[PDB]
Amino acid sequence: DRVKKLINSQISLLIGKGLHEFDSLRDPEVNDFRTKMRQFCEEAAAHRQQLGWVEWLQYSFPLQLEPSARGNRALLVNVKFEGSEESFTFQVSTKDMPLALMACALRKKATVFRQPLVEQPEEYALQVNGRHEYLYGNYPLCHFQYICSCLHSGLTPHLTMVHSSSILAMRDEQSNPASLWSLEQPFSIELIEGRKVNADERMKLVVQAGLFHGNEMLCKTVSSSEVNVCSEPVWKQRLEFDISVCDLPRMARLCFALYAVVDCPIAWANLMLFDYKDQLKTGERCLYMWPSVLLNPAGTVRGNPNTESAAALVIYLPEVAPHPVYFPALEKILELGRHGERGRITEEEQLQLREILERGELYEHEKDLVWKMRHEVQEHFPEALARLLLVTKWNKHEDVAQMLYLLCSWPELPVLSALELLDFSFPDCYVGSFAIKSLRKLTDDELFQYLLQLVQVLKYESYLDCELTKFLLGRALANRKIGHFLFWHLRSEMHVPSVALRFGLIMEAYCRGSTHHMKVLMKQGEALSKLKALNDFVKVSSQKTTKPQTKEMMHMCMRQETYMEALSHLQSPLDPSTLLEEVCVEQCTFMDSKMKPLWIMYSSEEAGSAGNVGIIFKNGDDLRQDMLTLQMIQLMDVLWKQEGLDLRMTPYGCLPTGDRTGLIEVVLHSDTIANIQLNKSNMAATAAFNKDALLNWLKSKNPGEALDRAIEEFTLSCAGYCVATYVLGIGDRHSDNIMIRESGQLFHIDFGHFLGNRERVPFILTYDFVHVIQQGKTNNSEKFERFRGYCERAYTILRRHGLLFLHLFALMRAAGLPELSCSKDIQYLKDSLALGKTEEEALKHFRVKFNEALRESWKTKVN
Numbered sequence: 001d002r003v004k005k006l007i008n009s010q011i012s013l014l015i016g017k018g019l020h021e022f023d024s025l026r027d028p029e030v031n032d033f034r035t036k037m038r039q040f041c042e043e044a045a046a047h048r049q050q051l052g053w054v055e056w057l058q059y060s061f062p063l064q065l066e067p068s069a070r071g072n073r074a075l076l077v078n079v080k081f082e083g084s085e086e087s088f089t090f091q092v093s094t095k096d097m098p099l100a101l102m103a104c105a106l107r108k109k110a111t112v113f114r115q116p117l118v119e120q121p122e123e124y125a126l127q128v129n130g131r132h133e134y135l136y137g138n139y140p141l142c143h144f145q146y147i148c149s150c151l152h153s154g155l156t157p158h159l160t161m162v163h164s165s166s167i168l169a170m171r172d173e174q175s176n177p178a179s180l181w182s183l184e185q186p187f188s189i190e191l192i193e194g195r196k197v198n199a200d201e202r203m204k205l206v207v208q209a210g211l212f213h214g215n216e217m218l219c220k221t222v223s224s225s226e227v228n229v230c231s232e233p234v235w236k237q238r239l240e241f242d243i244s245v246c247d248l249p250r251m252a253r254l255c256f257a258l259y260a261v262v263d264c265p266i267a268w269a270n271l272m273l274f275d276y277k278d279q280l281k282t283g284e285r286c287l288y289m290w291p292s293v294l295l296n297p298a299g300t301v302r303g304n305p306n307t308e309s310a311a312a313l314v315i316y317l318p319e320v321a322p323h324p325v326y327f328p329a330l331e332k333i334l335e336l337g338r339h340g341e342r343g344r345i346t347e348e349e350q351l352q353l354r355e356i357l358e359r360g361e362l363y364e365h366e367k368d369l370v371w372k373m374r375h376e377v378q379e380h381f382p383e384a385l386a387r388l389l390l391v392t393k394w395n396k397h398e399d400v401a402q403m404l405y406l407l408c409s410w411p412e413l414p415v416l417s418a419l420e421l422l423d424f425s426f427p428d429c430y431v432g433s434f435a436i437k438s439l440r441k442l443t444d445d446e447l448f449q450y451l452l453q454l455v456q457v458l459k460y461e462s463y464l465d466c467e468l469t470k471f472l473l474g475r476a477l478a479n480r481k482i483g484h485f486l487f488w489h490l491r492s493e494m495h496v497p498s499v500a501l502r503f504g505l506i507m508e509a510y511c512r513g514s515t516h517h518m519k520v521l522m523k524q525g526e527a528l529s530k531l532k533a534l535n536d537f538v539k540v541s542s543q544k545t546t547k548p549q550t551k552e553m554m555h556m557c558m559r560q561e562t563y564m565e566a567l568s569h570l571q572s573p574l575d576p577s578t579l580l581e582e583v584c585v586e587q588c589t590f591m592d593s594k595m596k597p598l599w600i601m602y603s604s605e606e607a608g609s610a611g612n613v614g615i616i617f618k619n620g621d622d623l624r625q626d627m628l629t630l631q632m633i634q635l636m637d638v639l640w641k642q643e644g645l646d647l648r649m650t651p652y653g654c655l656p657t658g659d660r661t662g663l664i665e666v667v668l669h670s671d672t673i674a675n676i677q678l679n680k681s682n683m684a685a686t687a688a689f690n691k692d693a694l695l696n697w698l699k700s701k702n703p704g705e706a707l708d709r710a711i712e713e714f715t716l717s718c719a720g721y722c723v724a725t726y727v728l729g730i731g732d733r734h735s736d737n738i739m740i741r742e743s744g745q746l747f748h749i750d751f752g753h754f755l756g757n758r759e760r761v762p763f764i765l766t767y768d769f770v771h772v773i774q775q776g777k778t779n780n781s782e783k784f785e786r787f788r789g790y791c792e793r794a795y796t797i798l799r800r801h802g803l804l805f806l807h808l809f810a811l812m813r814a815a816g817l818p819e820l821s822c823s824k825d826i827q828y829l830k831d832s833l834a835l836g837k838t839e840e841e842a843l844k845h846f847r848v849k850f851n852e853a854l855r856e857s858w859k860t861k862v863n
């Protein structure tokens with residue numbers, strides 16, 4: 001049909017890769033992935049189009065609740081009915097539930113319209129005016145993020161009564177169209193030749209080859225003979241490994257590194273020994289290599305798509321048997337693993353086992369004790385599953401079958417444990433399957449929190465069709481916000497050759513599951529394409545004329561019909577709940593920094609003040625580290641709020657959308673410390689002493705009794721960011737990358753460097769901020785020590801969730817961020833949270849660092 005052709009061309013444009021390219025590979029693994037995932041996503045779409053109207057509100061507008069509310073006071077609210085020019089303003093309590101507010105709005109309508117209504121409060125939901133956000137369910141108004149926000153900023157919540165028939169019309173309009181174990185001989189390969197090799201002709205070419213199960217060697221590495229450097233080297237030699245063909249585990253990867261010797265790294269390539277249908281690979285393989293920036297076991301197991309320029313290694317996998325050989329089925333593995341001797345051990349060694357399972361590297365004897373006592377690990381210490389998997393000999397089929405037998409009856413583990421099991425340190429497919437099974441209980445809020453890490457984990461997958469891909473696709477099709485962010489994390493990496501195929505395939509599958517969301521995302525892509533062209537113009541014009549001239553030309557370009565159309569009426573890529581309605585051209589500008597980022601403002605008559613939102617478009621810088629830093633700060637905020645600690649943080653949106661391209665959220669009514677300290681004349685903040693500048697500026701935005709609250713917001717947020725930058729090792733902090741809101745809230749921007757990348761970033765206490773905390777007084781120990789108490793409380797809360805931060809950062813090593821690429825980076829976090837200590841030892845150590853920072857601050861106070 002014409003529609004099928006149209007959807008295919010629309011998916012090709014959205015994902016940034018023509019669907020015909022997938023067909024041209026003539027790859028049965030790619031073909032099977034496309035078929036099975038299309039069917040799976042089409043089933044999810046059919047389940048969706050028939051949801052009840054409240055279930056469809058949960059899909060499209062998942063509730064945004066306060067972290068404390070997950071798992072009294074007078075309040076003024078403005079309520080109108082859909083398509084009404086008339087609204088009603090009434091008093092409710094923060095403890096009241098949406099239904100009581102709805103019943104109240106219905107009584108007011110019945111009185112004003114002089115008729116007894118047919119409608120009951122149960123037939124409606126409350127939309128947040130001009131936003132894709134709703135208040136529904138049995139939660140008090142204060143438990144909703146929107147009301148909580150209105151309450152702290154003093155503003156009046158504006159809501160719209162939306163009838164179930166209107167929600168159903170949305171549902172309807174948004175519808176998709178109508179045996180191995182006998183093979184004892186050592187594993188071996190034939191290294192035939194190399195093609196398109198480039199290196200110094202004075203050198204020799206060597207091929208280092210290794211067998212791996214994740215990062216662990218299955219046997220020692222084997223190297224070729226040294227052959228003269230030339231474009232087409234010829235080895236035609238046998239490389240025999242110290243492992244039997246029967247002992248190769250299911251996820252065994254064969255890793256290669258081509259290099260030059262007088263070391264000079266040239267290229268690397270990896271491949272799985274068994275294909276996607278569990279068959280042991282035989283025959284010739286031409287491996288298109290990746291250039292080395294020597295073995296790379298974590299590297300992708302798919303060849304370099306750039307066959308024209310890539311170095312190629314031709315290898316031969318020998319026919320081990322006259323018939324095809326498959327990895328044994330689970331029932332065959334369970335039969336072998338079912339037999340084994342159960343460990344009977346003394347109370348003295350039982351004390352030692354409990355000591356090492358609760359304790360982290362182990363000694364060789366401590367490993368044998370864990371392995372011998374594996375049944376006791378399962379029955380009494382099930383959370384120690386990861387330790388047991390790390391002592392298992394993955395290069396011995398009987399040990400693997402015994403481990404697999406126990407795993408197949410292992411109790412489901414907490415989400416924290418399951419996160420650890422997704423690391424490349426647990427490469428087995430059954431371990432991966434078990435980790436997903438324990439993650440199915442993740443709430444949509446917890447999943448959204450860890451989505452960025454789960455997407456990075458995809459880069460560790462050995463095959464296209466995997467449990468993690470299906471898990472992420474099913475959760476994305478069941479929650480529109482999850483779907484939104486899954487698409488953007490995949491899309492923003494389509495320029496990376498190693499992931500373009502996998503990521504391209506997942507995005508096609510998602511689009512099959514939601515035709516309407518594909519068109520919504522295409523409209524975002526159209527706006528981003530215009531912003532790129534607009535930004536290129538600005539970068540050029542900025543080197544030739546004055547800012548007033550570049551700014552006027554920018555506005556003229558935005559006022560073109562194609563730009564007004566493409567830049568208006570879209571869901572924000574930073575937050576699909578935020579609607580970017582009318583682009584306010586007069587308010588748009590660009591920033592004076594290197595990449596000249598665009599500052600784009602929007603307004604919405606339907607949303608009132610809440611509709612006044614902006615986005616910063618930046619091109620030329622990689623935004624992945626900023627996003628990760630901000631998500632870690634947002635996680636800290638959630639963890640603190642769960643302990644009743646609100647440090648008034650500003651975790652603003654930051655989202656990579658393409659190659660060195662992305663969006664950053666505009667925080668209105670905010671300015672940098674540097675701009676405020678310029679201490680300009682004929683201003684309400686002009687100071688007698690530059691130290692008075694921040695406090696005068698706060699005084700001008702908060703007259704009378706409001707000043708005390710602004711100083712309190714400043715103190716709380718300063719404690720949060722002092723702790724956050726210390727734990728994350730955020731250095732290069734100055735007056736131009738620290739901002740303050742009119743409310744008093746301090747926040748950081750532009751997170752270029754973290755994890756002390758290499759020197760230990762000390763705790764930072766700046767005098768200018770000590771001056772506001774102390775209310776402009778030289779000595780105010782009462783206020784300064786309340787601030788120290790907020791720092792200590794914030795730090796001790798984070799420490800308790802230390803393992804969560806460690807598991808998440810470990811998953812992030814897959815991202816390929818230069819500041820997060822080894823054990824040394826994770827070690828930094830281990831030191832900053834001082835996790836190898838008691839809470840008393842860590843707090844004493846934190847106080848030493850905090851006191852070391854105040855002495856450093858005093859070298860400015862004495863001046």
Ligand SMILES: COC(=O)c1cc(-c2cc(-c3ncc(CN4CCN(C(C)C)CC4)o3)c3c[nH]nc3c2)cnc1OC
Binds near residue numbers: 597626
């Ligand atoms: C240097 O630029 C970047 O590369 C960058 C910027 C931000 C940022 C800045 C402001 C911000 N800078 C200065 C201001 C204050 N002025 C803004 C323009 N106003 C005019 C148009 C009236 C005057 C006040 O703000 C951010 C503000 N919200 N979010 C920001 C992110 C975040 N990450 C960044 O890189 C990752």
